[PDB]
Amino acid sequence: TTVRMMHIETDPNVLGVWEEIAKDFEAKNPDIKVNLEFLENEAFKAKLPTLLQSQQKPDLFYSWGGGNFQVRAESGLLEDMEGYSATLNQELSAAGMNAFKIDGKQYGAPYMVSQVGFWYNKKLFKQAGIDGESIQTWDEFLTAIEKLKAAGITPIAVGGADKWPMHFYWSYLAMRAGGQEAFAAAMQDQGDGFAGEAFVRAGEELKRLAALEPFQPGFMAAGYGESAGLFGDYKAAIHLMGDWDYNFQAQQAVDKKGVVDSDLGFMNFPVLKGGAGAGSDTLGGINGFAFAKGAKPEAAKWLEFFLNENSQTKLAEIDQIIPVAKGADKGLKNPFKQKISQTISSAQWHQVFFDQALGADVGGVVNDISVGIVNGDVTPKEAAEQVQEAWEMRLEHH
Ligand SMILES: O[C@@H]1[C@@H](O)[C@H](O[C@@H]2[C@@H](O)[C@H](O)OC[C@H]2O)OC[C@H]1O
């Protein structure tokens, strides 16, 4: 039998490890072949809707959980693999398995957890006269931005063309302004919801950052790959990105090394004055693979092995993922990844990426108003009302 797994992975080292695991699995299981199918992130997300309606579908596809996963599970687009999940449940974290379980039905399995934060270049910070470790508040972050501006260094790389990198700013600002309580009320559409003060404040503070002109020339035409390459090429000082950026900025750098460890820093998103959120709250998520309707049981056998402790330990040791398999945290030797993994574990609020939490429609609105605020197209108040209004209609029509 042949199992097909659709993914968005571009890293050659990661893919080599995945192929090694596949080869090992195939030796232990001669009856089963594993075929990996790549689709680039933006194209993948765009095509999945029609793919899930087709008659030829992969067994497994990359998933962020969140809003689209829920709708797909309830709408009959995924396959319940609860009867083939005993070993997955033994090997993987229960919180990770629960993220892909709806109504007692197991529709996927976790692969990794992540944190979004500020990767930064200590060599460029020294040139501008900034101590990165002293940045604890948003006002201190803006002061650092102005010092980079005055030094003639591009402060921030962002892939504005893809929009979601910019949304990380609006999202974190809303988390810091309103805390978990505000987001929970907004999801329930209680009170003013997403049009509430926390979300307007997020827009106001994003507008304040944008007025400093901190992004690279042409950031609205730049995708994630170009933006990470600018960081890796020492041409931008700061990159707000998930922890997967550690290997990506190196792969996208001309020299294939990027910002080396002695020049590299990572810092949490700062706190906001007059904000209800805690500095230890993380934006990130639990990514995994979902089972499309019609998936064969052999796909669960593959996933059992692909996500086991040895496989996940390898992927942590090449500094790619923060693992979900029990015991694979032994592979978090790299100091950047070890510290990030501890932040994720200690977080009282760990929030899934807003665009994935809210689904393709409302999440697309959040992505649009993030770049819209920065470009002056929409005010912070108008942008928050757009999110609330789209969310209210999603609630009504489901
Ligand atoms: O919608 C965003 C996703 O597209 C993005 O996906 C990243 C992917 O770019 C990277 O290569 O692997 C991690 C994966 O999560 O995540 C953030 C979302 O906001």
Are 158 and 223 contacting, i.e. CB atoms less than 8 angstroms apart? no
Domain end: 315, 336, 351, which one? 351
Question: Which residue from 6, 7, 8 has its CB within 8 A of the most atoms of ligand 1, so it is best to mutate?
Answer: 8
Integer Cα distance of 226 and 211 in angstroms? 23
Same domain, 247 and 289: no
Task: Return the closest-CA partner of residue 209 out of 380, 65, 23.
Answer: 380
Pair type for strands 2-7 and 60-63:
parallel
Same domain, 235 and 331: no
Supply the residue whose CA is at minimum distance from atom 2 of ligand 1: 164
Pair type for strands 33-38 and 2-7:
parallel
Same domain, 276 and 292: no
Same domain, 332 and 362: no
The domain in which residue 393 lies consists of 116-281+353-397
Question: Which residue from 15, 356, 370 has its CB within 8 A of the most atoms of ligand 1, so it is best to mutate?
Answer: 356
Same domain, 164 and 251: yes
Question: Residue 206: enclosing H or E segment and its boundaries?
Answer: helix 197-210
Q: Please report the DSSP string for 315-369 in residue order.
A: HHHTT--EE-BTTGGGG--SHHHHHHHHHHHH-S-EEE-HHHHSHHHHHHHHHHH
Pocket residues for ligand 1 (CB within 6 Å)? 8, 41, 164, 224, 242, 244, 287, 353, 355-356
Distances (CA, A) of 280 to 233, 242, 249, 341: 30, 15, 25, 12
Q: Which residues pair with 120 in a beta bridge?
A: 238, 265
DSSP secondary structure code for residue 156 in this structure: B
Question: Which residue from 63, 116, 164 has its CB within 8 A of the most atoms of ligand 1, so it is best to mutate?
Answer: 164
Question: Residue 145: enclosing H or E segment and its boundaries?
Answer: helix 138-150
Are 120 and 232 contacting, i.e. CB atoms less than 8 angstroms apart? no
Supply the residue whose CA is at minimum distance from atom 8 of ligand 1: 41
Q: Please report the DSSP string for 119-133 in residue order.
A: EEEHHHHHHHT--GG
Distances (CA, A) of 184 to 179, 349, 362, 381, 385: 9, 11, 16, 19, 17
Rounded distance from Cα 27 to ligand 1 centre (Å): 32
Integer Cα distance of 183 and 193 in angstroms? 8
3-state secondary structure of 117: strand
What type of residue is 102? I
CA 65 to chain centroid: 11
Q: Domain with 255 in it: what CATH number?
A: 3.40.190.10
Integer Cα distance of 44 and 289 in angstroms? 13
Same domain, 263 and 371: yes
Rounded distance from Cα 76 to ligand 1 centre (Å): 25
Same domain, 357 and 256: yes
DSSP secondary structure code for residue 188 in this structure: T
Instruction: Kindly provide the resolution of this structure in angstroms, with one decimal.
Output: 1.6
Contacts of 183 (CB under 8 A, 6+ apart): 174, 175, 198, 351
3-state secondary structure of 38: strand
Structural gaps in the chain: residues followed by a C–N separation over 2.5 Å:
none
Supply the residue whose CA is at minimum distance from atom 12 of ligand 1: 244
Same domain, 386 and 250: yes
What is the Cα gyration radius of the chain?
Answer: 21
Residue 224 Cα: closest atom of ligand 1:
9
Same domain, 259 and 363: yes
Same domain, 290 and 317: yes
Rounded distance from Cα 151 to ligand 1 centre (Å): 32
Furthest-apart CA atoms within the chain: distance in Å: 63
Rounded distance from Cα 253 to ligand 1 centre (Å): 19
Integer Cα distance of 202 and 182 in angstroms? 12
Same domain, 388 and 302: no
Distances (CA, A) of 219 to 39, 129, 160, 214, 235: 24, 25, 5, 10, 13
Integer Cα distance of 128 and 56 in angstroms? 55
Identify each DSSP E strand in the chain by its residue range. Answer: 2-7, 33-38, 60-63, 101-102, 105-106, 108-121, 238-242, 264-267, 282-291, 322-323, 350-352
Structurally, the chain folds into a number of domains equal to 2
Are 112 and 344 contacting, i.e. CB atoms less than 8 angstroms apart? no
What type of residue is 109? A
Residue 287 Cα: closest atom of ligand 1:
15
| Residue-wise burial string across 44-55, b where 16 or more C-beta atoms lie within 10 A, e elsewhere | bbeebeebbeee
Same domain, 166 and 94: no
